[PDB]
Automatic annotation (TrEMBL), chains A, B, D:
Residues 7-35 form the Flagellar basal body rod protein N-terminal domain. This is Flagellar basal-body rod protein FlgG. It is found in: Bacterial flagellum basal body. InterPro entries: Flag_bb_rod_N (IPR001444), Flagellar_basal_body_rod_CS (IPR019776), Flagellar_FlgE/F/G (IPR020013), Flg_bb/hook_C_dom (IPR010930), FlgE/F/G-like (IPR037925), FlgG_G_neg (IPR012834), LlgE_F_G-like_D1 (IPR053967). It comes from Salmonella typhimurium. Residues 83-146 form the Flagellar hook protein FlgE/F/G-like D1 domain.
UniProtKB/TrEMBL annotation, chain C:
The basal body constitutes a major portion of the flagellar organelle and consists of four rings (L,P,S, and M) mounted on a central rod. The rod consists of about 26 subunits of FlgG in the distal portion, and FlgB, FlgC and FlgF are thought to build up the proximal portion of the rod with about 6 subunits each. Coiled coil: none annotated. It is found in: Bacterial flagellum basal body. This is Flagellar basal-body rod protein FlgG. Transmembrane segments: none annotated. Residues 1-55 form the Flagellar hook protein FlgE/F/G-like D1 domain. It comes from Salmonella typhimurium. Belongs to the flagella basal body rod proteins family.
Length: 247, 247, 104, 247
């Protein structure tokens, strides 16, 4: 009755949410530095009547759980492309003054010669970009050691450190592969790149998504199948309902 | 339901836009002084319900992002062909009075003896072209030091400077490999060629497109494959839809 | 929850609202016990399992506990009577109330 | 009762009108200079009884809303084919004396040597077409600078300006990709092509429809699915009706 009603309901929304999770987890290929999520089906409190006579409740997905793994990467060969071998996150300023974190390989200049990224999102710490800076020879740990015209020297026009945290599951994607520090994110530490969990700067390259598709295509197929099996359970429930409202 | 609907929609248009981007990025070989674009897939705001129970949205391509790299170049050996070693952009007048910028190696004369390009688009600054000017010995920095008939001297009949900017991503192709100054383009500076980021004049030659094809052919293949995988996701979604409208 | 005449109420409800004046109410204007003021810049609502209304406000990247709630237990819930739209109040046979910490 | 009756009715006609809209929006590929329409589902007035006890009415499509975007274009290479890069609309005379507007790339000559289009629809302003005019060298802004036999000069045998408006949603297709000025169309202004929102003349080419099909094929599939779900709602309503007329 109401038992099969709510049980079919929570199986229906569990399989629906699983379908939406893997559906959003297949379309996010070529998202830069991306870590993919997945739901975990878990029960609820059971209800024992007598020592063992229980009831049993719950098939619930708890939450979508991230997978912080370095995905595929591409050899792009541009000075405005920097990947990070291993871990360590970037630190860039949002234009409202707040910070941001990412794994990005696409940075630009504004009209006023500052270093920004993603079409005008300034870095942390900020770097002014000249026009006579011919070559851009970036050090592995933030040393923006460019060479200007008439200046035959790798002039360090900027120094950058990498921010590390304690639980990157608490970090949340806040729009176009950006992250900010949350409660469960951990404590920030812009340590020197190459130490304390931070990687180094690979100039010329980008990071991308850790999206394994064919495994999650099998997951799509089996979640569709379990959605249809929940539909079969609803069909049997409503067949009993119509045969008993005939009764 | 609507979740899988919009998710399949944005994966569909992301892969479609990627296919169109690489499709337009493969046909533009032999375009002179050309810098090729590419889209970047990026998420949107996620939606946390509880400290970590999120929703997650976005696979969006942000924009097509240019790659300002010197492509292939050809040895053409004509005085009306001038390439630029390195950087520095040309400055030519549009016939409505406005300026234009390019990396061109094909310039002409009008009926009235002025220096134009691309079939009647005047240079900046303008140069009058005589008829007794036998040889055209162009200096490396705009010195149009031609030698006229009866005048055994490299008569400088024109001086040209090269315009530099601050963010060439803001420059937009405004028709037949032309560019004009935009907001994000940077500040113009027609400095002497050979300094402040400007190159020199290579008389006899042209610049061309930075189009790497086989890498982007692999990109075409994988975007076709991901388009088909999004089609498989739509197929599973609609199979659940038809089996549940059977229910 | 508080009835608007000042008296208490008891339920098993999953539908709560805000008034015009930013307090926490339920069922279309029936205030909670204890009362909680609801801001506008509170973006996310991350509720603790035992009454910790640990919301996160705009510009405040912290689960700011804007309310604490305890659960009332009794001794014989048969004495509790439904007093209108799934509400209950303490009666004679209802038992003694105890707003203990949720989870115990 | 009547509630479910009218609700199923308006969902039925909303999904039916959506199906007809996307059905007519998929067959109009290769329509020249075409801007495609789409309906927008919107509610009606709700009916509050007490401060919040409402009723709620409306799922209505308001109207089919155009999308004024430049679609695909083809390289046809004929002097009677002219596309317009960007915006700006043509101005041609209907044979009853009234004007017309389009984005056309197919123009002809009559028996009496005037310039017409679409099989005898005269241009605005009218141009007489000779027989000894060998080449047709059209200027970018209406300069019909043809060269006649024995006349080695681009003889401007016509000048054309482009009409701009204020809200092209008010413009209505009045038969075979023609438009006329309506109330909501805006104020006409046959400005010089190349300015005030007007483009230029691309001799040799045509414009075509902005019809994206696979997205609207997904729209066809989901409107068919929602039509079937409205049919399921009607089925449940009539099942309650027959079980209660059994009662």
């Amino acid at each position: 009755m109401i038992s099969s009603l709510w049980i079919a309901k929570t199986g229906l929304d569990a399989q629906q949410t699983n379908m939406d999770v893997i559906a959003n987890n297949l379309a996010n290929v070529s998202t830069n530095g991306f870590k993919r999520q997945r739901a975990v089906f878990e029960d609820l409190l059971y209800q024992t009547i007598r020592q063992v006579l229980q009831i049993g409740t719950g098939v619930r997905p708890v939450a979508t759980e991230r997978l912080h793994s370095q995905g595929n990467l591409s050899q792009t060969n541009n000075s405005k492309d920097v990947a990070i071998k291993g871990q360590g996150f970037f630190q860039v300023m949002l234009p409202d003054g707040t910070s941001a974190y990412t794994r990005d390989g696409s940075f630009q200049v504004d009209q006023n010669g500052q270093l920004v990224t993603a079409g005008g999102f300034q870095v942390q710490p900020a770097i002014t970009i000249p026009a006579n800076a011919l070559s851009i020879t970036i050090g592995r740990d933030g040393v923006v050691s460019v060479t200007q015209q008439g200046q035959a020297a790798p002039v360090q026009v900027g120094q950058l450190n990498l921010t590390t945290f304690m639980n990157d599951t608490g970090l949340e994607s806040i729009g176009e592969n950006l992250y900010i520090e949350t409660q469960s994110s951990g404590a920030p530490n812009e340590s020197t790149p190459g130490l304390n969990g931070a990687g180094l700067l690979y100039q010329g390259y980008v990071e991308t998504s850790n999206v394994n598709v064919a495994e999650e295509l099998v997951n799509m197929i089996q979640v569709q199948r379990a959605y249809e099996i929940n539909s079969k359970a609803v069909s049997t429930t409503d067949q009993m309902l119509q045969k008993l409202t005939q009764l």
